[PDB]
Ligand binder design. Sequence first.
Ligand SMILES: Nc1ncnc2c1ncn2[C@@H]1O[C@H](COP(=O)(O)OP(=O)(O)O)[C@@H](O)[C@H]1O
Ligand SMILES: Nc1ncnc2c1ncn2[C@@H]1O[C@H](COP(=O)(O)OP(=O)(O)O)[C@@H](O)[C@H]1O
Ligand SMILES: Nc1ncnc2c1ncn2[C@@H]1O[C@H](COP(=O)(O)OP(=O)(O)O)[C@@H](O)[C@H]1O
Ligand SMILES: Nc1ncnc2c1ncn2[C@@H]1O[C@H](COP(=O)(O)OP(=O)(O)O)[C@@H](O)[C@H]1O
Ligand SMILES: [Mg+2]
Lengths: 335, 410, 369, 417
Amino acid sequence: EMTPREIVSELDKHIIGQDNAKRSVAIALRNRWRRMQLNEELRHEVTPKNILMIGPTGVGKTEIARRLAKLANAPFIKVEATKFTEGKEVDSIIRDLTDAAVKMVRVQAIEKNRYRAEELAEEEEAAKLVNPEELKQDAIDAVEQHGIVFIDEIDKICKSGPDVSREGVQRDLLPLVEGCTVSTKHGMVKTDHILFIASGAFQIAKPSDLIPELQGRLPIRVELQALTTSDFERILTEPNASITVQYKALMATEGVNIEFTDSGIKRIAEAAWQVNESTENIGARRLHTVLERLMEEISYDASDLSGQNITIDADYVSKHLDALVADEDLSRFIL
Amino acid sequence: HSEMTPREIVSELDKHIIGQDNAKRSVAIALRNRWRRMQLNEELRHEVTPKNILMIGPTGVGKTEIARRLAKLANAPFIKVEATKFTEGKEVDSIIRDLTDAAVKMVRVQAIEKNRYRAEELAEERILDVLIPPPSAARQAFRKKLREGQLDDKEIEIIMAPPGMEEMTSQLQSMFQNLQKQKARKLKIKDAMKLLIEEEAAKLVNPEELKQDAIDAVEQHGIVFIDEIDKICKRGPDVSREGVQRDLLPLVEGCTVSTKHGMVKTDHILFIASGAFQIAKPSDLIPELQGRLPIRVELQALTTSDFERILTEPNASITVQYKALMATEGVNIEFTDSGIKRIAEAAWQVNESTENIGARRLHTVLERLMEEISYDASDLSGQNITIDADYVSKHLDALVADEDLSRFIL
Amino acid sequence: HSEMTPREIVSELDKHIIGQDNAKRSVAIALRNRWRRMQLNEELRHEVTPKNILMIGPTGVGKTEIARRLAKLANAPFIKVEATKFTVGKEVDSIIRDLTDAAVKMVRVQAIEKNRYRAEELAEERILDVLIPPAPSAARQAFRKKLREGQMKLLIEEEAAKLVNPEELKQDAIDAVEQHGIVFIDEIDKICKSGPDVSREGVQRDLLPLVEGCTVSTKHGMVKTDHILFIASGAFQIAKPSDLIPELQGRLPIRVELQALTTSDFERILTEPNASITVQYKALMATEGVNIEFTDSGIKRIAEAAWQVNESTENIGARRLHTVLERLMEEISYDASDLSGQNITIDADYVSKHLDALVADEDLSRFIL
Amino acid sequence: HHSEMTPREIVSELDKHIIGQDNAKRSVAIALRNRWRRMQLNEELRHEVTPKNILMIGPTGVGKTEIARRLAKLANAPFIKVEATKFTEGKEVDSIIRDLTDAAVKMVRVQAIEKNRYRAEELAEERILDVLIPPSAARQAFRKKLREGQLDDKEIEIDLAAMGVEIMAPPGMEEMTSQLQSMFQNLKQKARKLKIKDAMKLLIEEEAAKLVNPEELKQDAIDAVEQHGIVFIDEIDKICKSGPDVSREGVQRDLLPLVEGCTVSTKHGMVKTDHILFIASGAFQIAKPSDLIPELQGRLPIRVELQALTTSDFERILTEPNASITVQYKALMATEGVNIEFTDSGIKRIAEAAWQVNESTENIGARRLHTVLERLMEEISYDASDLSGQNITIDADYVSKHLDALVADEDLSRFIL
Ligand SMILES: Nc1ncnc2c1ncn2[C@@H]1O[C@H](COP(=O)(O)OP(=O)(O)O)[C@@H](O)[C@H]1O
Ligand SMILES: Nc1ncnc2c1ncn2[C@@H]1O[C@H](COP(=O)(O)OP(=O)(O)O)[C@@H](O)[C@H]1O
Ligand SMILES: Nc1ncnc2c1ncn2[C@@H]1O[C@H](COP(=O)(O)OP(=O)(O)O)[C@@H](O)[C@H]1O
Ligand SMILES: Nc1ncnc2c1ncn2[C@@H]1O[C@H](COP(=O)(O)OP(=O)(O)O)[C@@H](O)[C@H]1O
Ligand SMILES: [Mg+2]
């Protein structure tokens, strides 16, 4: 129901940059509300516009999908395309998607049953109010209408020996996007109106190497740009509940105030940018390992530093990091 | 969740694990974040994920014991899995299935001990009903003779499936038993007392809450240890190796795994990975996995001085266990500082001579040294056997010298 | 469970296994530690793990027989599995499954015999209350002796159902598997150390949780392998125990080498062990009324015959004695019905008559012997 | 139940079916005799005595399986033949005991029904009499008149027991879904009209199942497998010894717990393979018995070579055995009304015809007598209807007329014979 611009503005609270991808996911989610307002004939002719994301690793392709489903209160699942090369069935994507929706409509029922069921409990009582038959069938309606599936590294299943087994995964994934019926333990699930989002680096292959039946089911295409040092500075502070905000609140539990200077944040980003260039580029995930290495001394002594204010400046960053980033052989192990 | 501080955690691990201070500090930080997360608001509890740990070091330096004692300290479910088990196949989700089952038996033993005394009283109470049909005097008489006396010897009348369906057929048999013991049958008080304890304890315990608490134990306090994760890194085989990491990814990133005991969410589960990393390197792991293992720590190889500490310092060390085992036979064993030093030098030499197996060499060396006393322990009763440096060099130096014999016997 | 000393175990094993004293002392220490752990406190019972044994020696020297007699001595569940069986593949957890199933039949038959005589005693006891209703003396004894000797089935069924409970059995069997379980893994040396090495070491990786302790699901319930005793054997001529994975070496603390059998040992195997193969043949012919006696010179030439065939072609161990005897006695075993009431003497000449012709031809020895 | 027949009595009985191979007959007679010898020992010696397994050596089609088949039929013993190569690919080796126990339960069920058939008829015809005269001297007269007479064509309504649910399952669950259906039938009778001719037979089935005890019928079948069971393993020489050698020897390693004695679980209970007699066979031209694993050689103490059949043995197999092929064909044509007669010279050329085809192309043993006979009797077996009332004499000339044209051409012999 949210407007396309309101979705992108909401995604800006988590993902930094990558505006092209945010506009793409907004179009797919907005058509969900647009289809609901149509007549009976057009609701079945209109199919969701699936997205094929393109960009290097660690630029936020998965976070955009996770925040998108969490925004729309939709079931979500991430599956690796290479898992089906070896074995596990391809239909299992809808199975785990169904089991996640059961838990989601169950937790929401537990919050409501913290009242009338509790009143008769302090006076099982929820089972006489929340019905497994009503709950389980409502979960099926959540998958058919609001289902969202993310297929990672779909570029690795493109094309003589392995190419037959790689493209076979595309052939088995084909009925899922084109729409079919998958049997689950919770009931019959239809994948016609489920949204699919595919991602891949596409450095070895190209989206044209996909089977033609699959290209027609991925109408929305978007390239995601690689993150820069200026983007890393933004990720540390701007996003809601960013890694520095989490660590600032985790240390406050011990009674320690943590403050990051503008010069320290800049050099933290310079360290993560250097490690990705020195050894291997893991994307924005390098900020995790670098921060934990930088803060391991403070996190251990936090119990004794209660009631103090520790200032993380540019000098404190270069003291605990410049020694390690300089040695590339050690950077692969520690960072 | 416990409220222990990192320094207090490490000081408790020092009672078990010798050395390896950095590794103790890494696991202490992860466990302290369990309580720090419980003190945040509702928005930050879901955003904060457990900081997993990737241990690096040679085999037999204590990587697993640090995890085992950590789970035992935090009263948490624990499971060790080999990374190479999923290369061949078994599903990766089995890690959460086997961890859940381990949490079920854990919360049961913890609930029986609290409710053991009441269950024992009710068990013997139903036995008195048969001895004296209805405390007056006779009931008090048979009650005291049952606990003190060995009169329990008295007689008193109180789906074929392929290998994959071994789990489901055991669940179907439990449903037919729910829809035997009630029938009056003849038993012995020794075998009927143990059978009446099971009946009374099962009535007192609640399967609804005990099963719900086990799910809370796996979701909130779950700890998973993945051994030899370095053997699945990229190098034909590189596609199958990296395929296991891709299947392990939804576990660290958080997903939903279904189990016989209910629905389990692996979001807040703590993971600890270890490996040698001589052939490969942690960078060889996929990028989505390196981000899920933010805490890294190298463990140092043990030294001869460390082996001396391992033999005695840890609570219930092997020298302490053997000292207590022969005491059952009535033999006092004593290890002198000069003997403990030569036991440690004997293990260090075998590892340098043939293959370095870590601290596990102390296990095979000790049993070889004490195989004579342990066989004759029933005859050494009432004696005080002292293990000095001479006794060690008499039974080991002949063996450690022959490297060909060193690989078979030690 | 049994309270026997290590020397009492070895002395009992001497009634079956000949020689191999080092291996007998090793298995005795393992079985004695079971009783030693039971006397410890609650903390040490979980910290103390059974000391597994890795036997080393050529084939046919008695590595398996020592394990079979040990479990039979301690009234313990036992199973023999080949290490190469798990090289799609069969799950390793089936070892504990087949061990549990074998323990159910083991404890069931032992429970049936206890009830077979106790239920029949109580079945006829209720019959006596209808004949001589008391308010046992001589009146009950008069009818009790006339009912057994003189010319019930529905009363045994009602009495046997009370003495044995199916629910009580399956739970008693689990205590026998978790506490007293004994597993024998044959030819473990063949799974030592690129592709064949990957499948070989994978068996060790899958076997690792069993010795380290874990939980395996069976149809009879949940079984924990922490306190199960494991005994591994192998020739170790191709590889060495150091070639095993390091996690496994630490789980096999007791090591023992077994010596190769000699001609003098073969002579002992024919007679010394209780119910030896010659004693069995003496009793099997005894069913027909035929006396069988083996001379000291005949037993020696029987052992020399088995030693020669193992030296000429391939050494199968002491099992060659079973094939040589049957070839020697095939004529007597066939004519035993007609020779009833006669006594044929098995001397060194009778052995050399039916064997020296066959043992001389190596081409025929591989087929016939 | 352990037959008290002497080894000579066993070989004497086997001669009625198998021709020659006296060495193999004495081997199997020794094995079956030990079954009774062990039953007569003390309790200690009954567990220590193990059955003396046999390994037969010889070319194909010499009677190895027949000697095994007739031996089990003589001892009233469960029997099964399995191909060793079946486990190279796969199926579990425990399935040998599974399929052996299944055939023994069916064996004890057919025998127990034939022995207790009089008791089940009693309740079936008595249930019918509750409908004719519902509750005397008049009730007895109805029972006597029905057995002698044919009053079963009259319409009578009797109450009889009357799920219809199918559970779809993948190919691996064909075994368990058949057992779940047996629990729903276990956890009411419906009244329907019938005919006494068709209701008596439908009542005997219900009465037969209710009268017999399931536990005694299921336990005696186990004792029949454990004590009196027999297993035959064919072409065991193909699992001998680097690529396939690991899988071939792996079959023997899986077969090892069967001969050494173990415990295999089945849907009918728990079976112990300790006292089960095993018989292995094989040509042993490629490999030799010494190539087996050492543990298996010791478990196969009795060894016997079977001699190859000759032209003189073929003439004996055509006539001597009971219900031989020529005897079966004389009786098959006897249905159409044709008296077939085989002359001595005709039988001799039939053996010489089969001997040449084996000598010319491939030697398939005594099985060549079947394809040659049917080729020789194809025109008569086709015209057997219209030849009713005639006496066809098969002489040496008639044999050469229909065979010498085919046997001469070797390219045609591989396809037609
Ligand atoms: N644009 C971004 N803004 C904020 N965080 C980001 C961004 N891109 C990546 N991240 C970080 O990377 C992680 C998610 O990476 P992911 O999207 O899985 O990589 P990829 O896009 O290569 O699949 C998150 O923890 C997130 O903090
Ligand atoms: N630092 C240590 N202190 C005490 N015991 C140790 C130490 N390191 C190893 N051990 C011994 O090693 C055994 C377990 O080794 P483990 O930790 O599994 O090896 P790894 O660390 O390679 O996984 C335990 O029995 C323990 O007694
Ligand atoms: N020391 C021994 N005493 C008596 N019999 C023995 C001895 N060693 C081997 N045997 C015979 O060998 C057979 C068991 O061999 P086994 O132990 O399976 O071989 P391995 O030890 O190579 O596994 C038994 O039939 C037994 O009669
Ligand atoms: N000695 C014999 N006496 C009677 N019939 C025989 C003899 N040898 C073979 N046959 C016949 O030939 C066929 C042999 O097949 P079979 O014995 O099962 O093959 P194999 O022994 O090679 O496994 C049987 O149908 C049997 O009727
Ligand atoms: Mg040696």
